[PDB]
Design a protein around this ligand. Structure first.
Ligand SMILES: [Cl-]
Ligand SMILES: [Cl-]
Length: 346
């Protein structure tokens, strides 16, 4: 049964969150392949119920399910039924486990080949109807899930030149703000639970610099208290490769981020939809990293979780804690990092 709740209530209920990354977001094998070929294309195992149950039973209350859609769409924007059903099945895994879950539109944005949703006004005009048709299908397919399911309009939207800090042309912000409005409109128009479902809109690049925040326009919504803003944080950039310990500079970098976000977003909750050690060339921690580097990961994660809790926000770990073959056991890949998070939250 759907029991409507405010966006802040949702965020406060997320607790510790996890990104099922490089899974349904994996892409590049082309169109018309078996569903499993996409899901395993970047080396992750096919997702199972036991994985979601493992998350809930081990101190997590929310999962973000990145999904990349373009190779599953025909020329008319119709989503292959088999793909939609697999997205539906993984959502249902999360629902059953009791988790909150977020479904998004992922590598349809940003710097990968095939990205088609861009902070560019020509691109917006050419793709807006396809974007609204995509969201209509997603909203209709996922309409009957309860308030534990949220939709996220788009991941890391960049301009045509893949600029990571801010768009080169200020007009790029118009495109982003218009897509955000279209996402909300398309979802709300389907009615039912989607009339009041909590929805998440992201900033340019999921960044949080001064210009990016100043030029973000929250969509107008016919109902109140049902929008969340999302940013990502791997700050200080490349620390995993340049820092020995999660030090004062690192900590001050994060406190300043939360202070900036709380100051900006006074009428809506925000979330840290991704964070982790991923830096230059996506180099990141693994369970074969030196003990000291694993401690660095643990310390970043403890800080992030506590600061987010203090700021009435919530966070989702990008991948590293529950990865590859460890998912099928299931077991943590990085239990010392998870332990640092659980004890920071508690
Ligand atoms: Cl590619
Ligand atoms: Cl990334």
């Amino acid at each position: 049964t759907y029991m409507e709740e405010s966006a802040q209530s949702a965020v406060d209920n997320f607790g510790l969150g996890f990104n099922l990354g490089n899974t349904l977001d994996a892409n590049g094998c082309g169109t018309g392949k078996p569903v499993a070929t996409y899901e395993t294309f970047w080396g992750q195992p096919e997702t199972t119920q036991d994985m979601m149950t493992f998350l809930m039973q081990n101190g997590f209350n929310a999962v973000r399910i990145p999904v990349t859609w373009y190779e599953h769409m025909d020329a008319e924007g119709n989503v292959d039924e088999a793909w939609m059903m697999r997205v539906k099945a993984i959502v249902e895994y999360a629902m059953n486990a009791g988790l909150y879950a977020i479904v998004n539109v992922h590598h349809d944005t940003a710097a990968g080949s095939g990205a088609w949703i861009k902070a560019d006004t020509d691109v917006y005009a050419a793709t807006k109807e396809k974007f609204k048709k995509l969201w209509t299908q997603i909203a209709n397919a996922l309409a009957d899930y309860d308030q534990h399911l949220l939709f996220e309009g788009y991941n890391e939207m960049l301009d045509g030149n893949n600029s990571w800090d801010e768009p080169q042309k200020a007009s790029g912000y118009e495109a982003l703000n218009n897509y955000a409005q279209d996402f909300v409109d398309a979802v709300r128009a389907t009615g039912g639970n989607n009339a009041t479902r909590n929805l998440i809109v992201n900033t340019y690049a999921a960044a949080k610099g001064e210009n990016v925040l100043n030029n973000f326009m929250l969509p107008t919504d016919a109902v109140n208290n049902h929008l969340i803003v999302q940013v990502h944080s791997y700050d200080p950039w490349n620390f995993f490769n340049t820092k020995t310990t999660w030090d004062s500079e690192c900590h001050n970098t994060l406190t300043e981020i939360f202070s900036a976000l709380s100051k900006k977003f006074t009428t809506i909750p925000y979330i840290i939809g991704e964070y982790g050690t991923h830096g230059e060339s996506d180099i990141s921690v693994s369970k074969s990293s030196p003990a000291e580097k694993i401690k660095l990961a643990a310390d970043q994660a403890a800080d992030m979780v506590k600061l987010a809790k203090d700021h009435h926000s919530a966070t989702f770990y990008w991948m590293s804690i529950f990865d590859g073959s460890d998912r099928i056991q299931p077991q943590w890949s990085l239990p010392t990092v998870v332990e640092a998070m659980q004890e920071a939250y508690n």
